[PDB]
Write a protein that binds this ligand. Structure first.
Ligand SMILES: *[C@@H]1O[C@H](CO)[C@@H](O[C@@H]2O[C@H](CO)[C@@H](O)[C@H](O)[C@H]2NC(C)=O)[C@H](O)[C@H]1NC(C)=O
Ligand SMILES: *[C@@H]1O[C@H](CO)[C@@H](O)[C@H](O)[C@H]1NC(C)=O
Ligand SMILES: *[C@@H]1O[C@H](CO)[C@@H](O)[C@H](O)[C@H]1NC(C)=O
Ligand SMILES: *[C@@H]1O[C@H](CO)[C@@H](O)[C@H](O)[C@H]1NC(C)=O
Ligand SMILES: [Cl-]
Ligand SMILES: [Zn+2]
Lengths: 13, 625
């Protein structure tokens, strides 16, 4: 899960 | 030639155009993996993850050129401030690879992990949907206990070593960014600085969570005791009337929600079933119907329709035995007017309410689409979840279920349907707050180093027993990693957002119903057909993350912080009725009684009436006013 966040750009599906 | 602020305007516009293009591309790759699970798609998704995280590293490095104390324009200063966060990139190229591999290994262990019938090795069951089917629908203490223990010893034990290493690396990353520990890093989401009276410090969050939890505790005590008495009616020899509920008998794999217990706990089952699942199947609703109905709910309050792209592109059902999908309800904002929802919609009230929740996410996204890139976000991790939850608060009311033909036209409100409804809601909403607080406090304690590794599981179950009133049916040594048996733990998601969300939503529902001119208790409110309330909501939604969550909250509800007051008012009739119900029962739980070590075949006693006389006296004195 790609996000518009710098701290957390990518989150595990 | 050019001042820092003009330089920064230029930099941010370059960043925004490239970031929009790249983010849309990467999100398309993510969509491909989540709808079509293939290695070709994993490879593309991972490649895009590299491109994207590396891009944000470069742009974060570039954003440090422009000092924040040389910036007048606030819209510029906020963007730069967000960009100046180092994130997890601070680690070495070696350790970053190791932590990424750990995260992937844990996520794969969770999603691929399967337990097989001991008598039939060739036939196995995955967590989704095979094991969940049991933990939701089974009534067998032994089948449920098998599934629960099996999952925690087959896949949990695989996760223990990885989680230990993961904690070490996460804490290295957090301290390298001048947080105390990874838990403090996570609490950083709720941080506010430089907004004068709207500031909020990271340690302040724990204080507010625990202070608000206090007032949840009595209601939870009483709901838990009523649920205990009802679960005794269904598992006769396996529950003590003074003990924590066994973990495997709670409605899902963890007791994260007590929602599926409703069929057993229904107060007045003679009255029509407020769970419209049965009605949903007698009316042959498919998934398309569920989402169209939700759309109608949003248009009714003056919000827009779903885009042509939404109906074209969304995957609203499980796509068949051929191609596997990630069946986790999610709302997709990819930019360029592209909004989707991925949900493997089942014909149940659970997915009806979820559909409303996830479409509420799409409303928040569509509202703040006009904001600059990094500010196209909620005011904190709990805001999106609260937005989703209030929609289900309206959708779940019997009033509303009647107006959409799930409850018959000759459906009368009464005391008993009101109690039915409040009990069900509390099963979903109150039952998860101790679960969530306990889990997150365990994690926070682990990351701060208050819990050594020799006492990971010991303390996990101490805290389940104490905070939640749930007891393991099987003793668990440190080879177990029970917390990582939940997705949010092994896939590296913060979890306190569900507690904060849960308070926000009622705070929101209060304010909106005032805007809707609702006379009546907060739990009979349905905001449908009120553009006035929809307007009041949209004003906050289009803001996005343009201003901090203290102010974003205050603008709608009038307070700068989390409030538990509305939540108690929502459930007050049920609090009264539950207290009356428990009048002759016990309330609370012993931390010491356990399924495996609480049984005693009462062959011979020592006193005439055992201690029951003393127990009556001691309980009289115990609850004395
Ligand atoms: C919101 O308003 C709509 C439009 O009036 C309601 O839909 C009507 O409901 C009545 C019953 O009250 C039916 O007799 C009509 O046939 C319905 N018309 C349409 C076009 O749907 C809807 O029930 C209202 N919902 C709420 C929650 O107030
Ligand atoms: C801040 O910059 C934006 C463009 O990035 C501009 O539209 C806006 O007017 C500026 N605000 C102020 C107060 O100058
Ligand atoms: C880390 O972030 C700070 C500001 O948050 C920045 O000054 C620094 O250059 C970054 N990188 C480090 C400390 O290596
Ligand atoms: C939403 O779509 C309906 C048709 O399904 C249309 O009548 C209505 O005007 C639309 N609302 C908005 C706000 O575009
Ligand atoms: Cl557990
Ligand atoms: Zn959601």
């Amino acid at each position: 899960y790609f996000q518009r966040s710098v701290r957390l750009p990518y989150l595990r599906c | 030639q050019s001042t820092i602020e003009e330089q920064a305007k230029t930099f941010l516009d370059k960043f925004n155009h490239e970031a929009e293009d790249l983010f849309y591309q990467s999100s398309l790759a993510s969509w491909n993996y989540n709808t079509n699970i293939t290695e070709e798609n994993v490879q593309n998704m991972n490649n895009a993850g590299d491109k994207w995280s590396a891009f944000l590293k470069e742009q974060s490095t570039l954003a440090q050129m422009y000092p924040l104390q040389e910036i007048q324009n606030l819209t510029v200063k906020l963007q730069l401030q967000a960009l100046q966060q180092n994130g997890s990139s601070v680690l070495s190229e070696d350790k970053s690879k190791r932590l990424n591999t750990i995260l992937n290994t844990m996520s794969t262990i969770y999603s691929t992990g399967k337990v097989c019938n001991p008598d039939n090795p060739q036939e196995c069951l995955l967590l989704e949907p095979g094991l969940n089917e049991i933990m939701a629908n089974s009534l067998d203490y032994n089948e449920r206990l098998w599934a629960w223990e099996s999952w925690r010893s087959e896949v949990g034990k695989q996760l223990r070593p990885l989680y230990e290493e993961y904690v070490v690396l996460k804490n290295e990353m957090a301290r390298a960014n001048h947080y105390e520990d990874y838990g403090d890093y996570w609490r950083g989401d709720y941080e506010v600085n430089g907004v004068d009276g709207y500031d909020y410090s990271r340690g302040q969050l724990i204080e507010d969570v625990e202070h608000t939890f206090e007032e949840i505790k009595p209601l939870y005590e009483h709901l838990h005791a009523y649920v205990r008495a009802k679960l005794m009616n269904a598992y006769p020899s396996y529950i003590s009337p003074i003990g924590c509920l066994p973990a495997h008998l709670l409605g899902d794999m963890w007791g994260r929600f007590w929602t599926n217990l409703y069929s057993l706990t229904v107060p007045f089952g003679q009255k029509p079933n407020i769970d419209v699942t049965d009605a949903m199947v007698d009316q042959a609703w498919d998934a398309q119907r569920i989402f169209k109905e939700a759309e109608k709910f949003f248009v009714s309050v003056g919000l827009p329709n779903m885009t042509q792209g939404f109906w074209e592109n969304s995957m609203l059902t499980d796509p068949g035995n051929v191609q596997k999908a990630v069946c986790h309800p999610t709302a997709w904002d990819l930019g360029k007017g592209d909004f989707r929802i991925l949900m493997c919609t089942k014909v149940t009230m659970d997915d009806f309410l979820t559909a409303h929740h996830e479409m509420g996410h799409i409303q928040y996204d569509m509202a703040y689409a006009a904001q600059p890139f990094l500010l196209r976000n909620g005011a904190n991790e709990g805001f999106h979840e609260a937005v989703g939850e209030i929609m289900s608060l309206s959708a779940a009311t019997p009033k509303h279920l009647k107006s959409i033909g799930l409850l018959s036209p000759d459906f009368q409100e009464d005391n008993e349907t009101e109690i039915n409804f409040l009990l069900k809601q509390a099963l979903t909403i109150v039952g998860t707050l101790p679960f969530t607080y306990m889990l997150e406090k365990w994690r926070w304690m682990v990351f701060k180093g208050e819990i050594p590794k020799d006492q990971w599981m010991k303390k996990w179950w101490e805290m389940k027993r104490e905070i939640v009133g749930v007891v393991e049916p099987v003793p668990h040594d440190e080879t177990y990693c029970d917390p990582a048996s939940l997705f949010h733990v092994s896939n590296d998601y913060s979890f306190i957002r569900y507690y904060t969300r849960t308070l926000y939503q009622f705070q929101f529902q209060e304010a909106l119903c005032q805007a809707a001119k609702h006379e009546g208790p907060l739990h009979k409110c349905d905001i449908s057909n009120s553009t006035e309330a929809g307007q009041k909501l949209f004003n906050m939604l289009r803001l996005g993350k343009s201003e901090p969550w203290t102010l974003a909250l205050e603008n709608v509800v009038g307070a700068k912080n989390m409030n538990v007051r509305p939540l108690l008012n929502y459930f007050e009739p049920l609090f009264t009725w539950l207290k009356d119900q428990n009048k002759n029962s016990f309330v609370g739980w012993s931390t010491d009684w356990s399924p495996y070590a609480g049984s005693h075949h009462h062959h011979h006693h020592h006193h005439h009436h055992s201690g029951l006389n003393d127990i009556f006296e001691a309980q009289k004195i115990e609850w004395h006013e």
